[PDB]
């Protein structure tokens, strides 16, 4: 993790982090884990993550990793503190639309975030619009947000 900003994965409510269009065999619990197990989808490669934090938290950077087989993300739209139906992601204003490149999606790439727009984040939803190889489904890895609590 970058100096001065911790890995916020333990901070989040594991019981309360829901996922949308997630294949049962690999789910959100396996997504947050550092191990090989992923979060694949069933309906389409399109997928909607929802992440609710325990306490107010700032997001400095994220590590939304995916396998380099092509199922990794190539278009991530991040939404902050929504008062999301797979049609809003089609037409809305993301906090920071992110084209996660192959370097960004590997096991070592971190994705910088606009720290200006990520300051008071009680709940965050990340949407995978498109993957890299135009496959039917996607796959994720230990998607963790790097930052500090609001305090």
């Amino acid at each position: 993790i970058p100096k001065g900003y911790m890995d916020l994965m333990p901070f989040i409510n594991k019981a309360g982090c829901e996922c949308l269009n997630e294949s049962d065999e690999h789910g959100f619990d396996n997504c947050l884990r550092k191990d090989t197990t992923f979060l694949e989808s069933d309906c389409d490669e399109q997928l909607l993550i929802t992440v609710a934090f325990n306490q107010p938290v700032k997001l400095y950077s994220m590590k939304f990793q995916g396998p380099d087989n092509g199922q990794g993300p190539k278009y991530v739209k991040i939404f902050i503190n929504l008062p999301m139906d797979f049609e809003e992601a089609e037409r809305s204003e993301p906090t920071q639309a992110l084209e996660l490149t192959e370097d960004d999606i590997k096991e070592d790439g971190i994705v910088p975030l606009r720290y200006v727009k990520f300051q008071n984040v009680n709940s965050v939803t990340i949407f995978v619009q498109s993957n890299q190889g135009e496959e039917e489904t996607t796959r994720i890895s230990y998607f963790t947000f790097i930052g500090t609590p609001v305090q």
Partner: protein, 272 residues
């Protein structure tokens, strides 16, 4: 950040700018004010798009006012002495809905048109001073007049003389500061004659601005060069030793004493 920008004025160093922009992007109120000011100092007169786009773009996204205040001064320094090459930025800043970014346009006019006496720039500052919604922008609009007229000092005590008596105390403070900035070190009799009534203004900070401006006008000045230097030197002492005067009236008086005898009576202020 203040130390780095002060030690890297006009160096246009990418490493200094990159590190400072990292501190600014942290969205911290205290360090944001520091980084924003330092960003302008490092990129002073560079007028590059990237520094302008990053800094002005940050100002429209940050929710901290202190960061905006530092950026407003910083944005102006990026386009210092840039003459008409700052027209595109100035009109963008002056039309902004953010009061602080509107203040940055006033400062940008001052730095881009420093000593040029450009009547088009003076036309813009006077328009904002008399017709604006925010008193801070009005106070900065009058203040920016001094940077445009210092090369021709006799002209400020005529454009600012009427603003010196306006209903708005912020414009009155700006008129005091405009006289101080333009007539700095000149010992202008006409400018001092305007500030002498200001030192008894009903509003406290207007008095402070006149006291500080009076020191800047006649720094190093003696009795023969300016007969009123002894009058103000006692006035500074009287305000400080007045237990019943406002605290910020005394702040101007104390700073006036330091400016009046700065550098051991061996320094002067001269923008030229």
């Amino acid at each position: 950040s203040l130390g780095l920008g002060l030690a890297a004025m006009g160096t246009a160093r990418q490493d200094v700018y990159d590190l400072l922009k990292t501190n600014l992007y942290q969205d911290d109120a205290v360090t944001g004010e520091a980084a924003g000011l330092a960003l302008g100092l490092v990129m002073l007169g560079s007028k590059n798009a990237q520094a302008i786009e990053d800094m002005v773009g940050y100002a429209q996204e940050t929710q901290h006012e202190k960061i905006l205040r530092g950026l407003a001064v910083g944005i102006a320094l990026v386009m210092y002495g840039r003459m008409e090459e700052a027209d595109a930025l100035i009109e963008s800043l002056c039309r902004d809905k953010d009061p602080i970014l509107r203040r940055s346009g006033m400062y940008t006019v001052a730095m881009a048109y420093c000593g040029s006496g450009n009547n088009k720039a003076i036309r813009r500052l006077l328009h904002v001073a008399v017709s604006d919604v925010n008193d801070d922008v009005r106070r900065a609009a009058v203040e920016s007049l001094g940077f445009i007229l210092f090369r021709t000092p006799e002209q400020c005590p005529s454009v600012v003389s009427l603003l010196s008596e306006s209903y708005n105390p912020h414009v009155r403070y700006g008129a005091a500061m405009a006289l101080g900035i333009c007539c700095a070190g000149t010992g202008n009799k006409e400018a001092i004659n305007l500030l002498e009534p200001m030192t008894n203004d009903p509003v406290n900070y207007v008095r402070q601005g006149a006291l500080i401006a009076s020191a800047l006008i006649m720094i190093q000045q003696t009795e023969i060069t300016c007969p009123k230097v002894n009058q103000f030197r006692q006035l500074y002492s009287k305000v400080i030793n007045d237990k019943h005067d406002d605290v910020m009236a005394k702040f101007g008086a104390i700073l006036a004493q330091g400016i009046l005898d700065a550098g051991g009576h061996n320094v002067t202020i001269s923008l030229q």
